[PDB]
């Protein structure tokens, strides 16, 4: 009925997996299998719809598909329409619906699902290697094949009942997002960005351009793509938003590809790259500058800081390179390098360090401030991220500003108590957004600092120096 209950049902459907392994282990099975069900259900409803024999009975849709699939007079045209529509076609017997029928017939063969995955992967480079993180024969599913088959089968049966295409509408997207978030709560690197925070960053990036078609959005440390996909709700032209994202972890990269497809992002509006954002700059081919940049880089990451980077356009303009031990600023300069000087807006959430640390970082901060790169500094409540309890900061950057002032907002107190965490509500986000739009001093909440004030603080941007 709702994304919440759809999320709950999808999560529960993996119960037979919770018994034999932890979340990090069954994560790929659940997320990948839900993804495949979506591709399969969507195709079937599409076939039935196109052949003017609309039925929300997937079993009936499969019957319709088989019928036209078997007729020489319709075979090739059917596949053409499917392929034109979604760039993939799945053999009738390999559809999730058909395999579940096998399960209930007592003839399900694990190899058929694998073949199904391959059907998709080989359909277009868009889907290649997508299911690689799934091992249907791992001992964790069971010691014997009958045990491995039985386990995967139990997941499919629970999954089979749930409606994900045809009516979930954009609910499936949110439900899938909830699943990813839930898996996030379970390391210390690239952390999941809490929805409230994602909303604030995205609303700021799109402010005044909600109707712009072809708005380009870039995240150089996208993770599961969850942050980027917030554009789907805050832009009024969601189907024309062009996404550019980069992720180093291949497994996470694949999850992001899935996330994009499940949020209905058109194939032509997806530009995802699997690589290290700091080593080789991407993209290099125009366009390289974007309307929006949203980033939540890896927490406490280190980087090369090779002397060679002082010849890199991304860092050379800023005096010194970010320290080997603190890649924070390197990620920020990389994002900034890719921000359009014409109205481009960038939001990046990082720990407070970059605001006050000295030496190299101080030098970079200073250079940034001299050209008015730092537009707004927002202090977030402590304990809102799942993998660290530290308070963080959302920094808003813009190029070519006339005013080199910095607007500080201390929102560390904007939160409600939650279950082992602090929660930010829409009202809290709205309060911050309202301050941001005004750039006005607000009692114990916000303060617009002039460049001279910044200078008298010796370029230190520690929030408490500006907001009471």
TrEMBL record:
PROSITE patterns referenced in this protein's UniProt entry, alphabetically: N6_MTASE (PS00092)
GO terms (molecular function) for this protein are:
DNA binding; N-methyltransferase activity; site-specific DNA-methyltransferase (adenine-specific) activity
Task: List where the protein spans the membrane.
Answer: none
Catalysis: reaction(s) = a 2'-deoxyadenosine in DNA + S-adenosyl-L-methionine = an N(6)-methyl-2'-deoxyadenosine in DNA + S-adenosyl-L-homocysteine + H(+)
User: What sequence ranges are listed for the domain N6 adenine-specific DNA methyltransferase N-terminal?
Assistant: 8-158
The catalytic activity of this protein is classed by the Enzyme Commission as: 2.1.1.72
Group of enzyme by EC = transferase
Q: Name one GO biological process term.
A: DNA restriction-modification system
Describe the location of the DNA methylase adenine-specific domain by residue ranges.
169-468
Key words, A-Z:
Methyltransferase, Restriction system, S-adenosyl-L-methionine, Transferase
Q: Which NCBIfam families match?
A: hsdM (TIGR00497)
Q: Which PANTHER family match?
A: SITE-SPECIFIC DNA-METHYLTRANSFERASE (ADENINE-SPECIFIC), SLR6095 PROTEIN
Q: Which family does it belong to?
A: Belongs to the N(4)/N(6)-methyltransferase family.
What is the official name of this protein in its record? site-specific DNA-methyltransferase (adenine-specific)
Give the source species.
Streptococcus thermophilus (strain ATCC BAA-250 / LMG 18311)
Q: What gene does this protein come from?
A: hsdM1
């Amino acid at each position: 009925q709702t994304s919440q209950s759809l999320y709950q049902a999808l999560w529960n459907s993996a119960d037979v997996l919770r018994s034999k392994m932890d979340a990090n282990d069954y994560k790929s099975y659940l997320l990948g299998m839900v993804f495949y069900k979506y591709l399969s259900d969507k195709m079937l409803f599409f076939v039935a719809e196109t052949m003017e024999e609309e039925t929300e009975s997937l079993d009936e849709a499969l019957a319709v598909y088989r019928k036209y699939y078997e007729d020489e007079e319709t075979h090739e045209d059917l596949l053409a329409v499917i392929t034109d529509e979604m760039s993939y076609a799945i053999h009738p017997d390999l559809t999730f619906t058909a395999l579940v029928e096998r399960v209930n017939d007592g003839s399900f063969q694990l190899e058929d699902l694998a073949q199904g995955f391959r059907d998709i992967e080989q359909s277009d480079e868009l889907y290649e290697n997508l299911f690689e993180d799934i091992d249907l024969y791992s001992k964790k599913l069971g010691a014997t094949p009958q045990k491995q088959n039985q386990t995967v089968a139990a997941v499919m049966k629970e999954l089979a009942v749930l409606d994900v295409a045809g009516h979930a509408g954009d609910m499936l997207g949110d439900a899938y997002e909830y699943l990813i978030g839930q898996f996030a709560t379970d390391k210390a690197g690239e952390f999941y960005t809490p929805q409230p925070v994602a909303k604030l960053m995205t609303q700021i990036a799109f402010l005044g351009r909600e109707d712009k078609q072809g708005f380009t959005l870039y995240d150089a440390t996208m993770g599961s793509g969850s942050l980027l996909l917030n554009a789907k709700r805050y832009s009024r032209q969601p189907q024309t938003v062009v996404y550019f994202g980069q992720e180093l972890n291949t497994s996470t990269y694949n999850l992001a590809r899935m996330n994009m497809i499940l949020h209905g992002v058109p194939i032509e509006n997806q530009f995802l790259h699997n690589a290290d954002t700091l080593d080789e700059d991407w993209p290099t081919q125009e366009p390289t500058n974007f309307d929006g940049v949203l980033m939540n880089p890896p927490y406490s990451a280190k980087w090369s800081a090779s002397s060679g980077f002082m010849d890199d356009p991304r860092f050379s303009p800023f005096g010194k390179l970010a320290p080997k031990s603190k890649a924070d600023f390197a990620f920020l300069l990389h994002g900034y390098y890719h921000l359009k000087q014409d109205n481009g807006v960038m939001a990046i959430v990082l720990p407070h360090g970059v605001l006050f640390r000295g030496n190299a970082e101080g030098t970079i901060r200073k250079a940034l401030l001299e050209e008015g790169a730092i537009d707004t500094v927002i202090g977030l409540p402590a304990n809102i991220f799942f993998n660290t309890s530290i308070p963080t900061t959302v920094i808003i950057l813009k190029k070519n500003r006339t005013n080199r002032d910095v607007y500080f907002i201390d929102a560390s107190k904007e939160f409600d108590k939650g279950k082992n965490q602090n929660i930010m509500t829409d009202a809290h986000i709205e309060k911050i957004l309202n301050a941001y739009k005004s750039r006005e001093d607000i009692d114990k909440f916000a303060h617009l600092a002039s460049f001279e004030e910044i200078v008298e603080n010796d370029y230190n941007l520690n929030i408490p120096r500006y907001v009471d």
